[PDB]
Amino acid sequence: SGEQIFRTRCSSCHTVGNTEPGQPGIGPDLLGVTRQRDANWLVRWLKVPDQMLAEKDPLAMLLFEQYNRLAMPNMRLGDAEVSALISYLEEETARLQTPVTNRGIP
Ligand code: HEC
Numbered sequence: 612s613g614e615q616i617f618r619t620r621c622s623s624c625h626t627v628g629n630t631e632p633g634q635p636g637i638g639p640d641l642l643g644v645t646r647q648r649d650a651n652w653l654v655r656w657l658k659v660p661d662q663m664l665a666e667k668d669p670l671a672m673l674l675f676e677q678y679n680r681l682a683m684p685n686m687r688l689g690d691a692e693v694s695a696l697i698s699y700l701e702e703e704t705a706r707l708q709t710p711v712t713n714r715g716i717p
Contacts, residue, residue: 612695612698612699613695613696613697613698613699613700613702614699614703616692616695616696616699617696617699620686620688621686621696623637624636624637624638624683625637625638625639625640625641626640626641626642627640627641627642627699627700627703627704627707628640628642628707635678635679636679637679637681638678638679638681638683639678641700642700642703642704642707642708643704643708644700645697645700645701645704646704649670652670653697654693654697656671657686657688657693657696658685658688658690658693659685660682660683660684660685661682661683661684661685662685664682
């Protein structure tokens with residue numbers, strides 16, 4: 612269900628596997644981030660991003676200047692609408708990880 616949420620309030624700056632190599636577009640690749648970044652921070656950042664950057668909470672201040680020097684605004688989503696989108700990033704990562712010694716596209 613989180614895939615429909617991605618397509619309607621998220622795909623404007625993102626993908627789940629499909630940035631350009633070492634070139635993060637308007638916003639970096641979400642596939643596998645659920646198993647790299649802190650699992651509380653990932654969901655909380657999505658609920659208050661431009662105001663976490665205004666708190667000067669330094670985890671964000673470090674990461675944003677190293678992708679594309681652009682800020683993410685708050686989309687103003689609801690908690691259960693976020694929970695479904697967390698389950699899209701988690702379950703699409705669980706299927707589209709493609710560790711078959713062939714993830715590339717010819
Ligand atoms: C363009 C205005 C954006 C929209 C809309 C969304 N995101 Fe984003 N994202 C954007 C940038 C510039 C960056 C870097 C700063 C930051 O927001 O962290 C990102 C990054 C992420 C990350 C963190 C990646 C990491 O290295 O850990 C996540 C997990 C993320 N964004 C999630 C996310 C979701 C779920 C959104 C749709 C509802 C969303 N973003 C919208 C820019 C933009």
